[PDB]
Amino acid sequence: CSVDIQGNDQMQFNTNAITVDKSCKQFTVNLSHPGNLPKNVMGHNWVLSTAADMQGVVTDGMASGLDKDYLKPDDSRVIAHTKLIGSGEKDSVTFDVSKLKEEQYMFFCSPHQGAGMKGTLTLK
Ligand SMILES: [Cu+]
Structure with a gap:
C-alpha cells in the first residue's frame, strides 16, 4: 500500500x-x-x-x-500532495483510498507537468 518514487534532474x-x-x-x-x-x-x-x-x-x-x-492554496481539486523537494530531500504523503473511485486519475509534479512530469494512478 505504498510506492517509492524518484524525481530527477x-x-x-x-x-x-x-x-x-x-x-x-x-x-x-x-x-x-x-x-x-x-x-x-x-x-x-x-x-x-x-x-x-x-x-x-x-x-x-x-x-x-x-x-x-506551486499549488493554489486550499485547492479542492488536489486529492493528495507532497511538499516541494530539492535534491537529497524526501517527503511522504498518505491519503485515504476511500477518496478514489474504482475514474481517470493523474499524478504529476506541478511545476514540471508541462515538461511531461506526470503519470496515471488507478485503484485496482
Ligand atoms: Cu518537478
Whole structure:
C-alpha cells in the first residue's frame, strides 16, 4: 500500500503508472530527488487529481509560485500532495483510498507537468 518514487534532474519521475490495490485503506507515496540541484532550481512535488482537473491544478499552481509550493492554496481539486523537494530531500504523503473511485486519475509534479512530469494512478 505504498510506492517509492524518484524525481530527477531531468524532470522525470521513475514511474509513470501507479496501481493502488483495492484492499488498501490508506496509500502512501514516498518521494525523493536524486540529483544535485536545489528546490529553487529543480524542485519536485507529487500531486494527485482527476484527469479532468489536472490542467487547472497545474496552471493555478504554477501561477501561485515557489513560495506556495506551486499549488493554489486550499485547492479542492488536489486529492493528495507532497511538499516541494530539492535534491537529497524526501517527503511522504498518505491519503485515504476511500477518496478514489474504482475514474481517470493523474499524478504529476506541478511545476514540471508541462515538461511531461506526470503519470496515471488507478485503484485496482
Ligand atoms: Cu518537478
